[PDB]
Amino acid sequence: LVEKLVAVDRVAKVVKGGRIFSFTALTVVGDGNGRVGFGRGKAREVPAAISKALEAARRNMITVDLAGTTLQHPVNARHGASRVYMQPASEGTGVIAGGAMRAVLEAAGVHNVLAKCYGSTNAANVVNATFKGLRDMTSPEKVAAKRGKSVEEIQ
RNA sequence: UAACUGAAGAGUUUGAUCAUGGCUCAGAUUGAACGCUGGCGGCAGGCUUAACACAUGCAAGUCGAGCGGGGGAAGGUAGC
Numbered sequence A: 001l002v003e004k005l006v007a008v009d010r011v012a013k014v015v016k017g018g019r020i021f022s023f024t025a026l027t028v029v030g031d032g033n034g035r036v037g038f039g040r041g042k043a044r045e046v047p048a049a050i051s052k053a054l055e056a057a058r059r060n061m062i063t064v065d066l067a068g069t070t071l072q073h074p075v076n077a078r079h080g081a082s083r084v085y086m087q088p089a090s091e092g093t094g095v096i097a098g099g100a101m102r103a104v105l106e107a108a109g110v111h112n113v114l115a116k117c118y119g120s121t122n123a124a125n126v127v128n129a130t131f132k133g134l135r136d137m138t139s140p141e142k143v144a145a146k147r148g149k150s151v152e153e154i155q
Numbered sequence B: 001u002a003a004c005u006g007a008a009g010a011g012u013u014u015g016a017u018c019a020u021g022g023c024u025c026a027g028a029u030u031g032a033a034c035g036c037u038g039g040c041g042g043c044a045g046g047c048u049u050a051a052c053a054c055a056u057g058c059a060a061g062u063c064g065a066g067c068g069g070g071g072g073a074a075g076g077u078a079g080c
């Protein structure tokens, strides 16, 4: 299980006499062969925040059906004001994406992809959109099963 | 055989936050200019502004097998 730390931020809460500071961490875990998840953690210190984020990421996982080491088809997804577009690429291309998309894709095991963000680039929302797109991407076997055809018929 | 295959973001409004939205940055390119410095070769390029005014030299001649004249050099014969 490879673990990646997308972002760490300091947040404040106002009380009488001053401010209480805390830290938030966003993490993505993945096996690298089709299983990936993400989570967030809040704590008064960075190590505890990262630990909580990793535990939440392990509790929130999905399974992704890749075509080799790339996507099955182009994907459009969005969460809130963040929109993402991902497209399969040939061998040797690599992962052409921003940091937030790159964490999720590398954790899921995608090796060749072209990706783009439109709208807001907030890390949590971008991770949400990429996660949803990867979850909703389909495969020829599922398409054939749902249509009642064969894979060769589907083409 | 081959004639293409292609898309990354970041900073900044607030005590935190998300969104909106400008401004700024990372790239490629140039008939460039300026500052510091400067060994060689190959191949290119070189008034983007005053279609402003121009000294001087050169950048369109050739034909005597179209024609009549006119020149000045070599020869020969005759006298001395």
Ligand SMILES: NCCC[C@H](N)CC(=O)NCCC[C@H](N)CC(=O)NCCC[C@H](N)CC(=O)N[C@@H]1[C@H](O)[C@@H](OC(N)=O)[C@@H](CO)O[C@H]1NC1=N[C@@H]2C(=O)NC[C@@H](O)[C@H]2N1
Residues within 6 Å of the ligand: A078, A079, A080, A127, A128, A129, A131, A132
């Ligand atoms: N919001 C607070 C509302 C407060 C409001 N005052 C309440 C009120 O007044 N009346 C109550 C009326 C409630 C209404 N009838 C039901 C309703 O809201 N239906 C719509 C919401 C569906 C559902 N409920 C929420 C949901 O499934 N979220 C998931 C979730 O976050 C996460 O997936 C998981 N599994 O964790 C993520 C992937 O990471 O995908 C999100 N999905 C999505 N993201 C996308 C996005 O944004 N756009 C486009 C599309 O793609 C979206 N789908």
